C-alpha cells in the first residue's frame, strides 16, 4: 500500500537530463576529485536549490538525485531533512538540531544532506517578535562558511516559492546556484508519462503515446501519476461493476485489470493541471477549427517574431564546450560572438491591428503556446488592478521590476484598446517612461493587439511602433479558408447515426456476481452558407457553427439525411439580423 | 437523551448515491485489491475532502461512510479526529499527536482516519509570528508522501470553507479529489425527510410527502432534523397543554404523541434554511398567482435558454462506462464527442427588455429556480459595492476570477438599467473587456433584464447582444391571463365564513389535569375589474389584489355575500389616480 511512487535516480524528473548533468558537476565533483582540494585548494560548488512550480515536485527529485549518487558514489550516505521542525522556544534547541545533523554527517563517511522545506526551516527574520529566526539563519549560514565549513558534505534546499528566503541563502558560498524545473513539455512529457506506465507488468497501451502526452501539460509528474491512477480505476470500473451494489467483502479471479483508451480519456477529463487550479493560463494552443482560418496569418506572424526575435530554443553550454576550436585565445574573437545576439536586435515590441471579433485573442494564447522557456507576464488589468495594498503605479514599477530581472522576457497585452482607458494619464506616462527606461540592447518582446484596425488607433499606439515591422495588419478571412472551415460539417451531416454515439442506444453490460468466499440535396446549402457571410466577422462563423451543431445534435438519430437541411438554411436566414 | 441522530451508513446524506459510489471507488479499493499494489504497484487514490455548505453537515457523512465501510470491510478500524486540538507551544507536541495517531493506525490492522476540522488542524501558514503552522502542514503532507506513505490507511479532511487551506492539501498525492454536497433538492430531499421519520415507531404521515419536501430546501439534513423536532413538540403541545400551567413534576399515561399536519406547518414557519440566515438567495420559484400571468412567457424563455444552453441536467460518467461500444479505440471518434458541447455554443449571453413593474425580476429568482447544479454569482451592486478593502475594479476582476474557475457558470444581473449608472466608465470598460476576455468555446450564461423596453436601451445594451436570439422582448399581460389571475378571488368571496378560519370563532380546548404521581350580483364587478386596467402594469394588479384581500379580510365573517361588492368597485374607482 504505497502512496509514493517508485521511479528513482532522476526517474521522477524524467525528460530533463540537462539539469541532471548540471548538478552532477557540482555535488559529484568534491567527492569525485578530493585531490584538487589542496592541489588547487578551492571549494567545488556544492549546495543546490531545488526550485520550480509544485506539481513537478521538489522532493521526488531529491531521492532522484539520491539514487543518482547512491550507487554512483560507492559509497555515500544521506541525511534527510523535511518540514519546518527545527524550531523551539529555546534558541539552542533549533540550534542543536541542525548542529547534530551536521556533526553526525561529520561523524560519517562521505555523505550528503537533504533540506526539504528550506522556507520553513530557514524563513525570513521577522525581527519584531521572533528572533529565533536570527539564530537559525545565522547557524545555517555558518554551517556553510561560518564556524563549520561545507566539508565533504553538501546541502540541498528544497524550495517552492522565492519569497520565503531572505537574500542570504541563494548566494554563492552556500549553494551558489538556482535550479528551476520547467514542466517537461511533450516528449520529456513522454518519458514522464511512460515511466509511470513502467509499473504495469501487463502490457499497457503507451505505444499510442505520445497521443496521451499531447494534452498532459501543466501537471508536473505527480499529477501525471494522478492521471495514470485515475485511468487505472477507470479500467477497474470498466472491468467490475461488482464494486458498488456489493455488500459483503469478497474476492475475484486473481488476475483482473485490462485498460482501455476510454479509461485514459475518463482520467483526462476529470482533473486540471497545476498552473490553473484557480488561475487561467494565458498560453493555449489554437483550436483545430481556428486553424483553417488562422494558420495562414499565424505562420507569417510567428515568422515575423522569429525575425524580430531569433530566439526560439535553448542553447546548451554543455555542447558548446563539447565542440571547441583552437582559434580561441583572445577576447576579440569573443567580442565577435558577444556582438551578435546583443547588437542584433532593437527593442522587441509588437502590436496587432484588426477588427473586433476578427480573431482577436484567438491567436493570443497560442503565440505564447508556440514557444516556451521564456520570461513572461501580462500588463492586463487582471493583475494591474489586482494590487490593493500598493498604488497602481506601484504595480507598474513592480511588474517592470519583475522585468528588471534580466531575461528574454515578454510584455503581454491582448486587445489593448480597452486598456489605456482603464488607467489614468499617470499610468500611461509610467508605462511609457518604463519603456524608455529600457535599452535597445536588451532582448524582450513587447506584445499587443487591437480590436481597432489601424488608421484609427489610439494616440499612444500611433507612435509606440510607427513602423510596418512593429505591427501586424489583419484582414477578413478568405472565402476558401471559410469553405474549409465548414468543410467537415458537410460530411458529418451525412454519416451521423453511426459515426457519433447518439444514433445508437448504448449497450447494456452484464457481469456475474463473482461468487464470494466471504448528396445533390446538399450543394444548395453549400452555396447558401457562402455569399451570405462574405464580410462576416470571425465570431459569426462561430455562431453558425454552434447553431448547426445544435441542429445535428437534434438530428443525431436521423437516417437518410439531406432531408434535414431546412433548419440549417432557415437558421442562416434568421441569423442575418 | 441523544442529541445526535441515528441514521448512519450514508443514511444522513440520503438521496445522493453518486458521490457514495464515487468515494467507494477510492478508499474502498486499496483495501479491496491489495494485489495490484505490486502487480501494478501504484497508489489507489485515497483521501477525501468532505466539503459543502453547512446544514448538509461535514461530519454526519463521516460516520455515514464509517458505517458504509465498517461491515462492508470485515474488518476495518477507525481513527477519528475532530477540532483543532493538534496545537501546542511545542513544535513537537502537535507533531507527536498526529504522529501517534499515524503509528497507532500503523500498529493496527486495515484502518481509516477521519479529519474533522482540517481548517483548524491544518490552517494556512502565517509565517510572521506563528510557525508551528509550518510544522503541522509539513508533517501532514509528509504523512501522505513524506517520511510516511499513505499506507493502507486513508485520510478524510472535513472542510467547511475553501479559504482555510493553503494550496498544498487538496492536491493529488494527499486526497487527489474534492467532494461537494449539493443539498438534496426534492426527492433526495424526500429520502432525507423520510429518514428522520424512520424514527417514529408509531406511523407518521409521510405518505403525504413529498408535500413536505417541497418547501424543505436549503436546510441540509440537520435543519430538516430541526424541522421534524419542531413539528414533534408542536404535536406535543397539541396533545398536552399540561406542560405549562403545571408546577410539580408529574406523569402521564404511558403512550402519548399523535402528530398533525398543522404541527408540520408550525415547524415549517418558525425557522429558515441555511443559504439565507442573513443573506437572501437570488433563486426562488414563481408564486402561484404570478403563474397565470407569467408561465406563458416563462415557458418560451426557458425553452430559449435551453436552446442557447442545452445543459439542463448532470451526466453520470458511471453510466457512460456502464454502456461502452466496441467502436472506440481511437481519438477521432473521441474528437466527435468533444466537438459537440464545445463547438456547439457561442458565448451564452442574454438580456430582457420590458417595462418597469412589467414582471421585471418576478421571474428573476425563478429562472435560476428552474435548474440547479450550475456555477453562479451576481454582478449586482450588493456584491459590487460589497467590497471595501479592494477597489471596485478589483472586485470586477475577483468575480470574473471566480468565473476564471472553469464551470458552466452564470453572470446574473436583474434590471441592469440602474446598473451602468452605478459605476464609473472604468467599471464598464472592465466588464466589457472581461467579456471579451472570454472565449466563445466556453459555456457560461450572461443574464440580464431591463425595466426599459428596447429601442430606448442603454448604448451598452444596444451592442452587447444585437440579436433577437440574445434578447427577450416583453409585452403587457393578455386580458384572458388576467381574468384567470382574478379567477379564484371571485369565488373565494362567495364561500368565506366557513372556507376560511375567520368566519368561525376558534374552538375551545379542554384537557384533564392528568393526575400526578409526584351570483348575478357579481358579474357587474367582473366587468368592472376588466377594461379599467387594460394597459395596466403587472404591479397594479398586485395592488388591487392586496386591496381586495383587505376587503375580504374585513368581510371574513360576512354571510350572504354579493352584498359586499361595493367596497370592491369603489376601491377600483379610487385606484385609477
Author numbering:
A (entry chain C), B (entry chain B): 256 to 773, 1128 to 1186
What does the paper say about this structure?
ATAD2 (also termed ANCCA) is a histone chaperone that has been implicated in nucleosome density regulation by histone H3–H4 loading or removal. Although histone chaperones responsible for nucleosome assembly and disassembly usually do not contain ATPase domains, ATAD2 is unique because it is the only known AAA+ ATPase histone chaperone. Here, we demonstrate ATP-dependent histone H3–H4 deposition onto DNA by Abo1, the fission yeast ortholog of ATAD2, using an in vitro single-molecule imaging technique, the DNA curtain. We solve the cryo-EM structures of Abo1 in three different nucleotide states (apo, ADP, and ATP), revealing a major reorganization of the AAA+ domains from an open spiral to a closed ring—a structural change that can also be recapitulated in real time by high-speed atomic force microscopy (HS-AFM).
In addition, we determined two cryo-EM structures in apo-states. One structure was determined to 4.3 Å resolution, which is similar in resolution to ADP-Abo1. The other structure that showed clear features of the bromodomain was determined to 6.9 Å resolution from data collected using a Volta phase plate. Therefore, we used the 4.3 Å resolution structure of apo-Abo1 for comparing with ATP- or ADP- bound states, and referred to the lower resolution structure of apo-Abo1 for describing the bromodomain. Especially in the low resolution cryo-EM structure of the apo-state, six lobes of density that match the expected dimensions of a bromodomain were arranged in a hexameric ring around a central lobe of density. On the outer face of the bromodomain ring, characteristic helical densities that run diagonal to the central ring axis could be observed. In addition, we also observed an extra density at the center of the bromodomains, although it is unclear whether this is part of Abo1 or a bound substrate. In most asymmetric states, only one blade disappeared from the field of view, but there were also rare transient cases where two blades of the ring disappeared simultaneously. These HS-AFM results were highly consistent with our cryo-EM structures that show a closed symmetric ring for apo- and ADP states and an open spiral in the ATP-state. The “hole” is formed by the AAA1 HBD, AAA2 HBD, and a linker that proceeds the AAA2 HBD. This unique addition, which we name the “linker arm”, stabilizes the hexameric conformation and explains how Abo1, in contrast to other AAA+ ATPases, can exist as a stable hexamer even in the absence of nucleotide.
